[PDB]
């Protein structure tokens, strides 16, 4: 399974900010204008228009990958063990061959 | 292929180098609202978990029993299995006896 | 000890984020707004995260009794008596640590995180999640038998102890209060409470405002000024409901507890099939008390796999 | 939610439960295009008649 | 037979004696546990009803 | 008369007894391990059966 890792969203007020690239897998970066947004005691910015959100997100492995992951395998010459029983007389053993 | 088995791929549990194609793409966030909305196709692994069916230990010919660490197929019932045999004179019984 | 574990928290606040849906239809900014549920346990259990701490006083200490939320721009405390995560129907809490809360759920399409207010209001967020796990075995079954076969699983391990698993930790933003300016005769009060507030007011003075009362000595009014809390002393959690400070590395960590390990769940064992045999033919009567599983195979050359999730009374 | 039944119910003034049920096959149809459970944090807003409080 | 109608039967309601099929088997009881644990195909009556 | 109904059981205790999971998902030896649930009834009641009294 991956994570999607999501940061905090770059909410810049009164002002703008540039994305950049990184090396992440799926990485995703946009810069948003015009944003004005409310937080829960009021608008979050003075400009009401000079805003600018960056929302960034990329894709990262699981924290549990290491434990709940499977395996794609080629698979080809396959050898063959067998365990024999023999017997005769006083003998009479099990051996792997 | 997002959605799919191998959306993402990882050569080995511990690689620093990891493949993802799950077509995570932001969109723009609500107006007033803080909250980095985007859309990414469902884990194709956790898509395969539930569709995989029962596995090769119940649909293999021959009534082999798979198991794994190491993969094997246990007890196959097919062939057959040469045998040379390099048996002492002092198993037998002289014919005087 | 469990009280080494929880100090953690210490140097971190909880946080009233936007939660879209607050059991009631409609939104509020929540103290109990639900950041991520994680569901990897093969077993079925559910680590669920919360804006919430679970187990902490308002001062960080470790308690058992206490939940801390934020009622505004203060630290606030109430009951873990009041704590009930749902499905369809109440799920079984089985440990909390902080933001995390790992639980047994029953099947259902929704989650819903609640608990009751210091003034003893229920406080809670609802998320849309289908959960409908995977059983174990060969069969759905329902509850845990008295007698069956422990088969290998995973589960979340109770334990509180730090972790690989681990979750970025960053100043506040500055949290906007609108309520921080009042007209005095045309001045602006910056009712500066035990605050550090930044603002701004076109014809102010603009900047930080610094702790302590400013006049705004001019006719600006509550139009063209603003006023936000700013330097606040403890981290919270980068969640995407809430603004980053600033593009800086975190400034610290707090670690996912219960780390998931390896263990048996006690599957039942299906009644053994009622059988008669007829020339080439085996007639089994099969009786299941939940959907289960029925295969057979062929071990000749061609077998020809048959597999059917048996729930009713079938021949 | 959706369900096949309505009970109301209240407390007596000595706290006795007394309460009604009817059969009342609560399946509502989905504003739009799909049947979604919970409300999004985005989404579309569809315009809807609900009761005002 | 197990599991349908009349895998038990009875003569008469007052009928001391009773024929009864019920695929009964008892299963060792699971390790520190007291349970008489057994497995039974259910009652082919209550199947038929 | 229902004390002298009742009175049978004053030769008797409660007990303790194995269960497999105590609501949630884990074994208990509650005092209330369900014995048998008998459904005989036509009209859907449930008699049960109960380790405490």
Not at chain 1, 3 to 30: A, H, L, M, N, R
Not at chain 3, 77 to 94: F, Q
Not at chain 3, 133 to 156: A, D, M, Q
Request: neutral net charge.
């Amino acid at each position: 399974e991956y994570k999607t890792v999501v940061p905090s969203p770059f909410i810049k007020c009164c002002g703008t900010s540039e994305c950049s690239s990184k090396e992440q897998p799926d990485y995703q970066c946009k810069v948003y204008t015009g944003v004005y947004p409310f937080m829960w005691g009021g608008a979050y910015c003075f400009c009401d228009s000079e805003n600018t959100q960056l929302s960034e997100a990329y894709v990262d492995r699981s924290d549990v990958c290491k434990h709940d992951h499977a395996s794609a395998y080629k698979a080809h010459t396959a050898s063959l063990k067998a365990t024999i029983r023999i017997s005769y007389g006083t003998i009479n053993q099990t051996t792997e061959a | 292929q997002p959605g799919r088995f191998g959306d993402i791929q990882s050569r080995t549990v511990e690689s620093k180098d990891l493949y993802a194609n799950t077509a995570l793409k932001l969109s723009r966030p609500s107006p007033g609202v803080v909250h980095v909305p985007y859309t990414q196709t469902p884990s194709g692994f956790k898509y395969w978990l539930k569709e995989k069916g029962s596995s090769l230990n119940t649909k293999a010919p021959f009534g082999c029993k798979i198991k794994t660490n190491p993969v094997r197929a246990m007890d196959c019932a097919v062939g057959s299995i040469p045998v040379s045999m390099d048996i002492p004179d002092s198993a037998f019984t002289r014919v005087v006896d | 000890s469990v009280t080494e574990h929880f100090n953690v928290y210490k140097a971190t606040r909880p946080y009233l984020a936007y939660c879209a849906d607050c059991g009631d239809g409609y939104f509020c900014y929540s103290p109990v707004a639900i950041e991520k549920i994680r569901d990897e346990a093969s077993d079925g259990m559910l680590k669920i995260q919360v804006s919430a701490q679970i187990g902490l006083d308002k001062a960080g200490t470790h308690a058992h009794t206490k939940i801390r939320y934020m009622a505004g721009h203060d630290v606030q405390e109430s009951k873990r008596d009041s704590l009930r995560v749902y499905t369809s129907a109440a799920c079984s809490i089985h440990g909390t640590m902080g933001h995390f809360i790992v639980a047994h759920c029953p099947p259902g399409d929704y989650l819903k995180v609640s608990f009751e207010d210091a003034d003893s209001h229920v406080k809670a967020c609802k998320v849309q999640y289908k959960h409908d796990p995977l059983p174990v075995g060969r069969e759905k079954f329902v509850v845990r038998p008295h007698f069956g076969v422990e088969l290998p699983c995973t589960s979340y391990q109770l334990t509180t102890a730090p972790t690989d698993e681990e979750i970025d930790m960053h100043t506040p933003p500055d949290i906007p209060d609108r309520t921080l300016l009042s007209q005095t005769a045309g001045n602006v009060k910056i009712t500066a409470g035990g605050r550090t507030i930044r603002y701004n007011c076109t014809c102010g003075r603009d900047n930080v405002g610094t702790t302590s009362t400013d006049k705004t000595i001019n006719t600006c009014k509550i139009d063209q000024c603003h006023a936000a809390v700013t330097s606040h002393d403890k981290w919270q959690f980068t969640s995407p409901f809430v603004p980053r400070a600033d593009q800086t590395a975190r400034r610290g960590k707090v670690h996912v507890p219960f780390p998931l390990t390896n263990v048996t769940c006690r599957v039942p064992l299906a009644r053994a099939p009622d059988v008669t045999y007829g020339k080439k033919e085996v007639t089994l009567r099969l009786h299941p008390d939940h959907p289960t599983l029925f295969s057979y195979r062929s071990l000749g050359a061609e077998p020809h796999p048959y597999e059917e999730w048996v729930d009713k009374f079938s021949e």
